[PDB]
Amino acid sequence: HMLTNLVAEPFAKLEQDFGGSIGVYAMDTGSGATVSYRAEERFPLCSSFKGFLAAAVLARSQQQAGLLDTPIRYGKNALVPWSPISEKYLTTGMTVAELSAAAVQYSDNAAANLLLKELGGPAGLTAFMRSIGDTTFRLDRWELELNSAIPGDARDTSSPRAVTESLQKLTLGSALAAPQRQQFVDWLKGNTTGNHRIRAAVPADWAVGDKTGTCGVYGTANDYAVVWPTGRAPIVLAVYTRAPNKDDKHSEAVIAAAARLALEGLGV
Ligand SMILES: C[C@@H](O)[C@@H](C(=O)O)[C@@H]1NC(C(=O)O)=C([C@H]2CCCO2)S1
């Protein structure tokens, strides 16, 4: 608990200035050191579930060979607001792997709902998370309803600690087979939506894979990431925020600042 106490006061000041709640968990995978602040509280997942969704698809592909290259055709009624990739392939279809990359790297909502259907819905994704030992994660709704971020509502939430623990298992641990694990890392490394969050907190030479979430209400936004300091063991971390009023705005700068404090607490 020593490293957590080191940054406890700076985290409290950061969330006071933000006007809401910040939850952070960070793990140095070399030393095992951790930093926690509200790490066991529930926060809305928002779009960040899409990373775990892609991992669940990769897990299924270990059993169903050829799943990733399966073509998926869809109609205009499958389009959801903010579907920047899948709308460009409406007239052609996309493969499961392309939908997964679009969900991870562009937060594509039509792709996410199509993949949720392939997994058996929100309960199917929740079941995958249970299968890797995550008892906290719950997905309950589809896009876009899952973004309501209602104060006190446990639907479509997890905790920063559970997010970090699951991310570690999937990117660095044994929850996925080696080829699928590297594909998951590669998709996260290619994310385009996180340049102002955890990525803004790390040195330019560090490799980073991340997935963001932005609910659009209640100051609710987040980011989780695996980061590789050059020549050293990776760090896994999650930063989640929420705020009391529906009209409260989220802040990418606060997410980046919290990531910096977590890394400073860990000693890097
Ligand atoms: C409902 C949507 O507003 C939201 C979502 O699909 O979940 C988008 N995703 C996120 C994210 O943080 O992943 C925002 C980013 C993505 C691209 C620029 O804003 S908006």
Ligand 1 centroid – CA 30 distance (Å): 32
Q: Is 228 annotated as a binding residue?
A: no
Domain total of the chain: 1
- How many whole angstroms separate alpha carbon 41 and alpha carbon 37? 9
Phi-psi region of 82 (alpha: psi -120 to 50; beta: other; left: phi over 0): left
- Ligand 1, closest atom to CA 214? 12
- How many whole angstroms separate alpha carbon 156 and alpha carbon 56? 16
Q: Take atom 4 of ligand 1 and give the residue whose Cα is closest.
A: 214
3-state secondary structure of 236: strand
- How many whole angstroms separate alpha carbon 46 and alpha carbon 96? 22
Q: For residue 24, what are the β-bridge partners?
A: 37, 239
The residue whose CB lies within 8 Å of the most ligand 1 atoms, and thus the one to mutate among 46, 83, 249, is 46
Which residues are marked as active site? 47, 145
Which token pair is 232?
């050293």
Other C-beta atoms lying within 10 Å of the C-beta of residue 15:
20
CA distances, 235 to each of 121, 142, 229, 262 (Å): 31, 31, 8, 10
What resolution in angstroms does the PDB record give? Answer: 1.4
User: Which residues have C-beta within 8 Å of that of residue 13, sequence separation ≥ 6?
Assistant: none
Residue whose entry in the numeric block shows the structure tokens 């600042």: 257
For ligand 1, is residue 136 a contact (CB within 6 Å)? no
Structural domain including 265 reads 1-268
Q: Is 83 annotated as a binding residue?
A: no
- 129-266-194 Cα angle (round to 5): 55
Which token pair is 22?
């910040």
Q: Take atom 11 of ligand 1 and give the residue whose Cα is closest.
A: 213
Q: Is 135 annotated as a binding residue?
A: no
For ligand 1, is residue 214 a contact (CB within 6 Å)? yes
**Which CATH number goes with the domain that contains 127?**
3.40.710.10
